[PDB]
Amino acid sequence: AECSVDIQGNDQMQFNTNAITVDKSCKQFTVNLSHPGNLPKNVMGHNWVLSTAADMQGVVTDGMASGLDKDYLKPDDSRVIAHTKLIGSGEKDSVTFDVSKLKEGEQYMFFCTFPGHSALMKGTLTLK
Amino acid sequence: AECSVDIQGNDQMQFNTNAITVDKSCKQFTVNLSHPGNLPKNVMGHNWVLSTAADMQGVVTDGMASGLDKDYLKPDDSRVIAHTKLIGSGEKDSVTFDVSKLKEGEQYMFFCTFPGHSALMKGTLTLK
Amino acid sequence: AECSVDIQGNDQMQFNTNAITVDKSCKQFTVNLSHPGNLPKNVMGHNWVLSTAADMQGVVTDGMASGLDKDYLKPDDSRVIAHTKLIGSGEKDSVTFDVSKLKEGEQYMFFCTFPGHSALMKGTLTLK
Amino acid sequence: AECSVDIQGNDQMQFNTNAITVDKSCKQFTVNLSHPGNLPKNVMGHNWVLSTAADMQGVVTDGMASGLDKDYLKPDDSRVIAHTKLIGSGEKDSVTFDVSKLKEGEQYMFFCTFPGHSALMKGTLTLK
Ligand SMILES: [Co+2]
Numbered sequence: 001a002e003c004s005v006d007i008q009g010n011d012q013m014q015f016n017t018n019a020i021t022v023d024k025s026c027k028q029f030t031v032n033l034s035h036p037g038n039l040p041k042n043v044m045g046h047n048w049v050l051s052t053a054a055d056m057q058g059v060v061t062d063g064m065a066s067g068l069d070k071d072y073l074k075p076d077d078s079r080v081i082a083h084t085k086l087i088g089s090g091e092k093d094s095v096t097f098d099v100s101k102l103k104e105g106e107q108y109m110f111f112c113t114f115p116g117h118s119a120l121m122k123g124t125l126t127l128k
Numbered sequence: 129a130e131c132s133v134d135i136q137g138n139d140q141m142q143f144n145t146n147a148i149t150v151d152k153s154c155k156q157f158t159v160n161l162s163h164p165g166n167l168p169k170n171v172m173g174h175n176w177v178l179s180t181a182a183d184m185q186g187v188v189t190d191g192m193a194s195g196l197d198k199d200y201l202k203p204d205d206s207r208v209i210a211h212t213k214l215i216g217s218g219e220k221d222s223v224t225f226d227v228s229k230l231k232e233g234e235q236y237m238f239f240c241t242f243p244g245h246s247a248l249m250k251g252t253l254t255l256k
Numbered sequence: 257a258e259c260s261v262d263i264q265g266n267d268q269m270q271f272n273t274n275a276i277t278v279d280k281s282c283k284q285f286t287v288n289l290s291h292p293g294n295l296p297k298n299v300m301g302h303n304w305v306l307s308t309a310a311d312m313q314g315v316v317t318d319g320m321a322s323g324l325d326k327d328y329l330k331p332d333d334s335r336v337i338a339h340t341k342l343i344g345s346g347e348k349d350s351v352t353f354d355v356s357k358l359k360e361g362e363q364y365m366f367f368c369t370f371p372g373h374s375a376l377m378k379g380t381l382t383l384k
Numbered sequence: 385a386e387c388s389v390d391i392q393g394n395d396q397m398q399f400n401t402n403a404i405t406v407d408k409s410c411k412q413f414t415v416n417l418s419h420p421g422n423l424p425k426n427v428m429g430h431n432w433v434l435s436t437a438a439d440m441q442g443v444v445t446d447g448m449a450s451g452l453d454k455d456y457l458k459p460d461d462s463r464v465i466a467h468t469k470l471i472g473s474g475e476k477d478s479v480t481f482d483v484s485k486l487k488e489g490e491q492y493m494f495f496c497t498f499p500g501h502s503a504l505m506k507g508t509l510t511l512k
């Protein structure tokens with residue numbers, strides 16, 4: 001899939017991938033998140049969030065503080081480049097962002113903000 | 129001390145310890161479980177369940193299947209030596225079991241049956 | 257691949273894949289393991305081990321007790337269906353086994369036995 | 385007590401707590417770290433490093449490059465507020481620091497820099 005990627009977050013709190021690459025030719029980029037499995041969103045919610053590796057911790061810590069009702073993300077969080085909604089099993093969501101929001105020579109991370117999940121669910125995103 | 133132990137499961141899906149030792153001089157052993165944090169039982173519940181290491185996976189799988197209504201535990205599971213109720217933040221439980229139900233030379237595990245949790249929340253229990 | 261799979265273990269304690277499907281038509285099945293990255297064996301050691309889901313905890317526990325010189329695997333562990341050596345970055349290893357060693361209706365896990373890596377490095381393997 | 389906290393980092397790559405709150409009335413604050421278990425420092429070393437959340441990634445990445453020889457921390461790292469030595473099992477270390485190096489409103493994290501360990505061995509520290 002050019003300028004896009006499909007990623008799954010399953011019931012074992014695992015994303016199917018740990019590395020995403022964005023082609024510099026891509027003007028925009030889409031990340032499609034699906035959740036195979038059977039567990040509902042309150043027990044095994046998955047969202048997908050992108051930020052520099054530097055801000056990942058603060059976004060997680062603040063996302064937790066915001067709670068369920070907030071999809072565990074601090075609203076208008078200026079550190080978040082892009083993020084999907086928190087989904088439960090069987091659901092799907094995509095988020096498209098401008099590639100110009102990313103510098104070559106900077107480390108980014110994608111990760112889930114549901115409490116405790118980032119330990120397991122995280123990977124790197126890099127321009128190419 | 130000695131014949132009882134205070135355990136906490138937090139909002140970051142972790143127990144405060146991963147090892148417990150039962151002195152053979154105890155007739156009974158009491159485990160007190162509290163849930164520091166702010167998240168609800170339906171989102172981040174914790175119980176504390178004891179079984180041989182060999183039966184743990186069955187207990188976790190059959191528990192998952194049982195749903196929130198059953199405290200993520202299969203009714204009358206004979207594999208479970210003991211267990212607390214499933215608790216939410218700001219809640220607590222206690223459970224006592226006769227030390228005679230344990231044998232020296234057998235590998236025992238304590239853990240949480242709330243979906244996905246045992247991956248991180250578990251520990252060893254030994255008769256020493 | 258055909259009756260085989262290539263899997264990598266990295267410096268971020270992650271396997272590139274978390275679900276392995278073995279086809280019944282396969283007489284044998286090959287698992288190729290590589291460790292991209294730059295960290296050595298005593299620090300970011302990776303082996304790939306296969307056992308029923310029920311046997312995983314005992315294998316990991318006895319494995320931690322075998323020591324580094326034993327690749328953190330108890331020699332002659334009857335629960336281990338197949339395994340690799342413990343490798344560091346830049347190294348590679350593979351193991352092939354008979355598909356008749358697996359049965360329909362049983363749950364299998366693949367995992368790393370290096371101290372503290374199995375909570376993050378594990379996946380399922382199923383005979384289809 | 386009051387201006388001190390006991391932290392244990394075990395053989396399962398975890399800390400006993402994930403949140404430290406330092407009371408403003410403290411002039412100095414102590415972190416006593418111990419290491420229950422039996423694994424050695426070259427395989428399951430733990431330290432206790434403090435810095436702002438925004439800085440954690442850098443301290444971890446740079447520390448990971450410094451090596452065992454440097455206790456997995458960059459010498460004279462200007463982002464490190466306080467830190468312990470890297471310890472193996474049965475060892476203990478303590479670090480006391482001036483509370484005026486912390487400011488209200490700023491998010492601090494404590495973590496272990498041995499490669500890979502920060503996935504699970506981290507927590508927050510707040511001046512309250
Ligand atoms: Co999630």
Ligand SMILES: [Co+2]
Pocket residue numbers: 137172173174175240241242245249
């Ligand atoms: Co739990």
Ligand SMILES: [Co+2]
Pocket residue numbers: 265300301302303368369370373377
């Ligand atoms: Co490993």
Ligand SMILES: [Co+2]
Pocket residue numbers: 393428429430431496497498501505
């Ligand atoms: Co450590």
